[PDB]
Paper text:
[name] is a bacterium that preys upon a wide range of other Gram-negative bacteria, entering their periplasm and consuming them from within. Proteomic and structural analyses of vesicle contents reveal several fibre-like proteins, which we name the mosaic adhesive trimer (MAT) superfamily, and show localization on the predator surface before prey encounter. Structural studies reveal a variety of domain usages (and therefore binding capabilities) at the fibre C-termini, placing these on intertwined trimeric β-prisms. Using independent but complementary approaches, we identified and characterized a MAT superfamily of trimeric fibre proteins with diverse adhesive tips, able to fulfil the long-sought-after role of multiplicity of molecular recognition and handling of diverse epitopes (across a wide prey range), by the bacterial predator [name].
A region comprising N662 to the C-terminus of [name] was determined to 2.5 Å resolution. The [name] tip is 150 Å long, differentiated into three subdomains —two β-helix regions akin to Bd3182 (G683–E813 and N814–A907) and a β-sandwich domain that substitutes for the S74 chaperone (W913–K1031). The latter two domains are linked by a stalk-like linear peptide (A906AGAAT). Despite a general agreement in the β-helix region, [name] does not possess a Bd3182/S74-like cleft. Equivalents to the Bd3182 capping loops are present, demonstrative of common principles in the S74 and NS74 subgroupings. The β-sandwich tip domain of [name] adopts a twisted fold, trimerizing about strand G989–W999 (burying 5,640 Å2 per monomer). During [name] refinement, we noticed additional density at the sandwich tip, where the trimer interface creates a pocket using Y985, N956 and N1020. Guided by crystal symmetry, we have modelled this as an N-terminal hexapeptide derived from a nearby copy. Negative-stain electron microscopy of full-length [name] (residues 21–1,031) confirmed fibre formation, with dimensions commensurate with an AlphaFold18 model and our partial structural determination, showing fibre conformational flexibility.
Numbering used by the authors:
A (entry chain A), B (entry chain A), C (entry chain A): 681 to 686, 694 to 1031
The structure:
């Protein structure tokens, strides 16, 4: 050996010039003219050449085109393999020599760049857009470590559709839609509102701003109208005790948030004298919700005093309402009538 | 014929070895050295070769590179056609022999795979990402069966923009935006809220959860303040009938949801005796909304009883409010005054 | 010269036919059989040929395949350059001759079409889908005029993730997520609601529709329960003036929206006679919020009249509440007690 690291037909000439094997045909008018090299076996073959400037064989291309043609012959299923056993790239230059920008590049590590020789991802389009077309084209994302939990962004009937997809990529399930109108739907598919959500909407912080006056809300709801019950008595009121009196709410209101009650009292020639702050209230455990009505009996008087109030109380879990005299007025010539008149 | 299914220069040798035509140039230092085959017509030609390891002709590549070069000559508009007339693939291998993973594959049915020989879509990037770059690069989706109802996902000024697009792909109309801040806007373009929607937001089910206390709301709105009208009388109250009395609401409140009213009554030496549950109410068709005030005249008495209440009633479509004595108290030494004092 | 615009081995024949240089090997059974052209220098070389139908050299492909093979030799880092110095295209045809649809096209201006010879963008997939696969594959959009303000649509654990990204494409920050469940989150990452927004939600117009009854809301919030204070006196009421009396709200309610107050009055043998419309109100600048309670003293009477009311008033910025007699009733045998009983 020498340690110096450097055929049926062999053409060799050492020179500061291309050593060239040329095939040539200058016939400018023959429909079948051309020049080409062919490598073949007994079944098929591969051709490398250029057609004449009047060549009509569209199987190879247009007149004057160049071609690399792997023929059919009697062979089937054959590949054409383009192989760079090198750490360089495969460069495709079109409309320039190699001094131009490579239109496409396949690096030695598998990356593919369009309009860039240095791709950053497996496919990288430099300084340009991408488009896909069809009757329902979709950009799909297939996750390999999971099973049938894939995604896609597609178009259908002008609606941009974000849909899940299976590992076979053939059973989409629309989850989000945006129409040409600009309306978005999440679980809806014909979004009429600017944003329809077929489900609960949650503000984790901040709450909800409104458009008429930029109203900011982070609470709940209220009311405006109510169901009347007329003068539905809650029971007899004792006039002789200052202890707590309970009353059971009508079944109809046992499902309400608020109840409206009416308390009326009168006193003529009473058996006591003094100010009775009647307390009306509902209970949620320790908490109470409290209203008062004044009843001032004056013993012996030849007249009749009277008072009433109508007010709202929270409807609580125990379905009761309570009443308590601060001073027992007495039943003599006096009265106290307690009614539930509405609920909501 | 035989049924056995199997040139200006013809090189044939049947053998268990490559039959080879070789051109060769070992000049390692010439700036113009190389070896190549050329097929040409009278206008242009195509070269297949390798340059010398000191070749400086950058039109073909870097020193020592291999090349397929379709020349310009005097020909214009010509194609280079790479043709596999076979049901196999076109394989591009870079950095390996054919025993490696094909970097790119073009199947016989038109599918293109990067890093996979078995693509599932027309373009399929196996085990890698895709990126597009520019000053406003966009992934576009063109629908062919429709006319100018296309979509795209682009970037502009750090904002991810989902915009409709025409079949010419040159007139985007932003519909959704997400900023680097993380804010989303639907019909807005400078989203300040975490989610701005230039239009109605609809919860089809579930309603709306809140962040302070996880409040869940599926209703509407209420109030807190109101417009005062002072003591604006609603009209004279008859003291002599138990039939329904109507009164017309002031024009100012005819647009409100609720009205606040004040009813006062007094009775001295009256002409009747008994409990009068005065009923004050508003009407929506069959429905009524009802309050009561007690008035207990006592004939002959040398004193004056008095009562009043101030309360809210729904403002209804007929713009009226009504009053009804359960017992006519009489006008003698007595009075009933009815006022609308506010609305909201 | 003539103005007419039209080698170590030179093969030329002008004819209406291909002028052909052929190399051929019909050995159908040799594991090493093949036919090929080779261009080489002293380090490496490039081969163009076809393998025998029993050729086992997988480095070139499968038996009978055709190949363009840029060899390793003693050369490193070398490119294979495919160059069309023409305004035409580079066409890749697979499964057809050039009369078919080009599977891939590289135009002279750099555009790349799959299944189309006339691409509209730098990369254009005609009548087909695109898919990317991996353990977390992403479609990325890199903006060049800005610095580290890029976007991407990826998949991770079945969740479609819209995340910002840097110009190095290696530090994603999830901003929007959609789960296989169909739930969307903006700033959340495990969306439980159909739409979670970790921040304020803004309706620029239209407001908010609801699902139970299609309720439409564009306002704010209300209440239902409240904090009781019992009978907490607001101060002494003067009985001798019709001028405005102020009272300071308890510190506990100075942070509330509404306050609930209780006013009681009684009158026996008074020193005046007439109707006193006691006015109770809160102030926001010019605006007042007004309730009234009737007190009708009757001088000399041998009885005691009484009245009370309990009602809600807006809690205003000045933390005061006010009271005003329309006629001073007098302190003789009479009383007026004013309490704040609740707030919310
Ligand atoms: Cl009275
Ligand atoms: Cl009262
Ligand atoms: Na009274």
């Amino acid at each position: 050996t020498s340690g110096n690291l450097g055929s049926a037909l062999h053409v060799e000439r050492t020179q500061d010039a291309d050593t060239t094997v040329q095939v040539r045909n200058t016939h400018d008018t023959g429909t079948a003219a051309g020049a080409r090299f062919i490598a073949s076996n007994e079944k098929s073959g591969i051709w490398f050449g250029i057609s004449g400037t009047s060549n009509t064989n569209t199987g190879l291309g247009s007149p004057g085109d160049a071609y690399i043609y792997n023929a059919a012959g009697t062979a089937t299923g054959k590949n054409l393999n383009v192989i760079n056993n090198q750490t360089g790239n495969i460069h495709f230059f079109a409309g320039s020599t190699a001094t131009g920008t490579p239109r496409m590049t396949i690096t030695n590590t598998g990356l593919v760049g369009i309009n860039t020789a240095a791709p950053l991802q497996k496919l990288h389009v430099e300084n340009g857009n991408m488009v896909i077309t069809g009757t329902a084209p979709a950009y799909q994302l297939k996750e390999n470590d999971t099973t049938d939990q894939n995604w896609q962004m597609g178009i259908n009937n002008g609606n941009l559709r974000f849909a899940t997809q299976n590992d076979a990529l053939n059973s989409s399930s629309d989850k989000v839609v945006i129409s040409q109108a600009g309306n978005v739907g999440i679980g809806a598919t014909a979004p009429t509102a600017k944003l329809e959500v077929a489900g609960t909407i949650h503000s984790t912080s901040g709450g909800i701003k409104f458009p008429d006056g930029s109203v900011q809300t982070t609470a709940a709801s209220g009311a405006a109208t109510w169901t009347s019950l007329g003068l539905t008595s809650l029971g007899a009121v004792s006039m002789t005790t200052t202890t707590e009196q309970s009353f059971t709410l009508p079944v109809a209101a046992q499902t309400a948030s608020q109840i409206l009650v009416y308390l009326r009292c009168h006193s003529g020639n009473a058996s006591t004298t003094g100010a009775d702050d009647i307390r009306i209230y509902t209970k949620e455990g320790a908490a109470t919700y409290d209203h008062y009505l004044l009843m001032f009996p004056y013993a012996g008087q030849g007249a009749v005093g009277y008072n009433s109030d109508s007010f709202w109380l929270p409807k609580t879990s125990d379905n009761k309402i309570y009443l308590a005299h601060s001073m027992a007025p007495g039943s003599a010539n006096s009265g106290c009538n307690f009614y539930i008149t509405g609920y909501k």
